Design a protein around this ligand. Sequence first.
Ligand SMILES: Nc1ncnc2c1ncn2[C@@H]1O[C@H](COP(=O)(O)OP(=O)(O)OP(O)(O)=S)[C@@H](O)[C@H]1O
Ligand SMILES: [Cl-]
Length: 310
Amino acid sequence: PDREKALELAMAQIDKNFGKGSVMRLGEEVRQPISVIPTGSISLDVALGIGGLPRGRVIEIYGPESSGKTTVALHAVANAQAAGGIAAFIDAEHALDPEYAKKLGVDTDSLLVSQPDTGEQALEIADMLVRSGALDIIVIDSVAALVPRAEIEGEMGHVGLQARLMSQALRKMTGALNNSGTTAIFINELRTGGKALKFYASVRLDVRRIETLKDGTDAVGNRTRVKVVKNKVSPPFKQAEFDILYGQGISREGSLIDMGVEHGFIRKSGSWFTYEGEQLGQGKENARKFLLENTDVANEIEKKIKEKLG
Ligand SMILES: Nc1ncnc2c1ncn2[C@@H]1O[C@H](COP(=O)(O)OP(=O)(O)OP(O)(O)=S)[C@@H](O)[C@H]1O
Ligand SMILES: [Cl-]
């Protein structure tokens, strides 16, 4: 017996039988792909281990209200579009603020939006789109808002039908999703169908608000924390953090400062961030700004960090 040789032989057959990623060692550092979707969060992009959401996969983003799920998803779309991709937003919440979306860099005008009459119609419309192979990314707002038709329409006290709907739906949309090469983000709100999504998801993000961006003493935004509780394309359980200002989305410069520091590219003498010899400022915010204005800097930092990792 040769354990490691026997185990590898095992794994190999396991992945063959159920797909790559069926099993993997946690420390394992996986081989990156040909063009993921920058989550808009450098840290998260890293936690996902492939620099962003995997295309042609089902992505669930759950968490409480105000935790930043929609924000993240928007950025996802933006990038998808920045890459000349076509986007679709299946809205069953009617909560979208396109003005903010634009600010996150979404081309709202070219963005397709549907506002279904029932959970069925929703997913159906979603299926039909996906399988046109024109969409790079699609978003479904509120797994919960996918209420069956029988219930929306007047129906008696019943079933366990919302889950079945969601289940069957995913069943076919996945095949398509894969052939299409389109990523499907399902925003799930922690306040029914998530039962299925748990198993169909390739990636599952547990998003929640941790801090109240205050800087010194005033409301700015909030610090989010995402845990990749499920990851079928890279070791799971990675966590990342980042800032979302009010009105502004995920602070790229905020991620850059933070990750740049923990990775020694930007030195932080107490109270004063410094990089490569140039002074960046006292207090994250001053640094953030500096990086915001001096777009050349940060870009360097964005490169440097990118390299050392993935
Ligand atoms: N329309 C908006 N205008 C200004 N800031 C917004 C807006 N929407 C979201 N934000 C910012 O993003 C934070 C919340 O992130 P969301 O985009 O709401 O993601 P989320 O909470 O999962 O989505 P919900 O609550 O289902 S909409 C807010 O606290 C603000 O910092
Ligand atoms: Cl990003």
